[PDB]
Amino acid sequence: SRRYDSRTTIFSPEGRLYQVEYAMEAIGHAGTCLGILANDGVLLAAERRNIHKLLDEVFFSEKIYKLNEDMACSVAGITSDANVLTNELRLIAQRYLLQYQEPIPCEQLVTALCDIKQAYTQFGGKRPFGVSLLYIGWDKHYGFQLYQSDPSGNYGGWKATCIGNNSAAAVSMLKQDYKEGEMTLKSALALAIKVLNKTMLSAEKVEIATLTRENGKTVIRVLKQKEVEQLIKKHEEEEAKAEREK
C-alpha cells in the first residue's frame, strides 16, 4: 500500500539518501572501533559496551569476529545487523575457497559484502543495514590490509582508521601519531591504547585483536586481560614520565 510505504530507497531533493545518512548517524553513537596497520601485523581495538557486572563471558570476543583463516572484522552499529553481515561474510569467503581452493583476498571479500549493502540502498524498499565494519586481513597479493565499510556500501583501505563514538577525534590523533611505513605491532598497540584512552580506559573495557604471520601461516589472537593490563600500565607510566619531564 502506497500510503504506509516509507520509501527507503529514494533520492531526496538535494541528491541524498536519507536512510543511509540516518544509519551512519546510528553508527556514530556505537562503540568505538579502531584499526591500525603495521609492517609486521594489523590490529583491531574495540570499546566494550556490554560492561554490566552480571554479564557472563562465553564467546571468543564481544565485537571481533573471525571471518576466515586470514581475516577478521569489528562492527560498529546495530548488533543484529552485524550478525547478519558477519554470517554473509563467512559464507562469501567459504564460497570463494570452494571455487578456487585458495583463501579469498581481503578486498574481494569487502567488495562482495559492500555490493549487498549497496543493493539494499538501491531497490527492495527495505531499510539499509545500520553497520560499519573494520576488516583486518592478510593475503599474498597485498600483504597486511585494513579496510573500512559503511552502510552506503562505500569502502576504503586505510593505514589507520576509527569508526563509532568519537571517531573524528581518534582520526585526528592517528593523523598526528601514525608513522607511515615505520609502525611495528608493539608501537601500533601503544598508539591504539593512547587513542582509546583519549576517546573515552581499563582492561575490561577494551578488546584487542592482533593479526600476524608466523611460519607462512596467519595467526589471529585476542589479547588476554594480562596483556591488555600490561599495555595500559605501560601507557600510564609513559604518560607519567612525559608529564614529569615538562
Partner 1 sequence: ERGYSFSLTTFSPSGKLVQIEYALAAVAGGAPSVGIKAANGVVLATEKKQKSILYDERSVHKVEPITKHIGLVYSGMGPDYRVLVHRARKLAQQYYLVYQEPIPTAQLVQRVASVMQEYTQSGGVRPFGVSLLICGWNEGRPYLFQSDPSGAYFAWKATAMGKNYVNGKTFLEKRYNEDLELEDAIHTAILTLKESFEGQMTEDNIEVGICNEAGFRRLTPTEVKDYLAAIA
Partner 2 sequence: SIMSYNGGAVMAMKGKNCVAIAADRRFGIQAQMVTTDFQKIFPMGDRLYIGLAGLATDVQTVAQRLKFRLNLYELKEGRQIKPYTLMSMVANLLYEKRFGPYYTEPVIAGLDPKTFKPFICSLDLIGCPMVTDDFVVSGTCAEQMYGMCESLWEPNMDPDHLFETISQAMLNAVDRDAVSGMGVIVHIIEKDKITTRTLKARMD
Partner 3 sequence: SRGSSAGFDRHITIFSPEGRLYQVEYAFKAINQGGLTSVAVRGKDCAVIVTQKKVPDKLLDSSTVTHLFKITENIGCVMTGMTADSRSQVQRARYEAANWKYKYGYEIPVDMLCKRIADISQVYTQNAEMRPLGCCMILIGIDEEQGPQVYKCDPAGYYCGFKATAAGVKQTESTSFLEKKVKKKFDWTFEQTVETAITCLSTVLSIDFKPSEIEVGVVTVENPKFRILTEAEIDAHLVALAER
Closest among 156, 145, 136, 159 to 210, alpha carbons compared: 136
If phi over 0 gives left and psi between -120 and 50 gives alpha, with beta otherwise, what is residue 127? beta
Gap between the Cα atoms of 69 and 139, Å rounded? 10
Tell whether residue 4 is a contact of partner 3 (CB under 8 A).
Answer: yes
Q: Specify the residue, 11 or 59, whose C-beta has the smaller distance to partner 2.
A: 59
CB of 73 to partner 1, least distance (A): 17
Q: Choosing among partner 2, partner 1, partner 3, none, which partner's interface includes residue 22 (Cβ < 5 to 8 Å by kind)?
A: partner 1
Q: Smallest distance, Å, CB 22 to partner 3?
A: 15
Residues in the chain: 246
**Which of 48, 49, 66, 213 contacts partner 2 by CB under 8 A?**
66
Long-range contacts of the stretch 83-90 (C-beta < 8 A, 24+) = 84/129, 85/113, 85/116, 85/117, 85/129, 85/131, 85/133, 88/113, 88/116, 89/65, 89/113
Closer to partner 3 by CB, 3 or 52: give it.
3
Q: Among 54, 59, 225, 246, which residue sits at the site for partner 2 (rule: CB under 8 A)?
A: 59
Nearer to partner 1, 53 or 241 (CB): 53
Distances (CA, A) of 66 to 37, 54, 60, 171, 223: 17, 26, 9, 25, 14
Question: Does residue 90 touch partner 2 according to CB under 8 A?
Answer: yes
**Residue 51 contact partner, candidates partner 1, partner 2, partner 3, none, CB within 5 to 8 A by sort of partner:** none
176 is an interface residue for partner 3 by CB under 8 A: no
- List interacting residues with partner 2 (CB under 8 A): 59-60, 66-68, 87, 90-91, 94-95, 97-98, 101
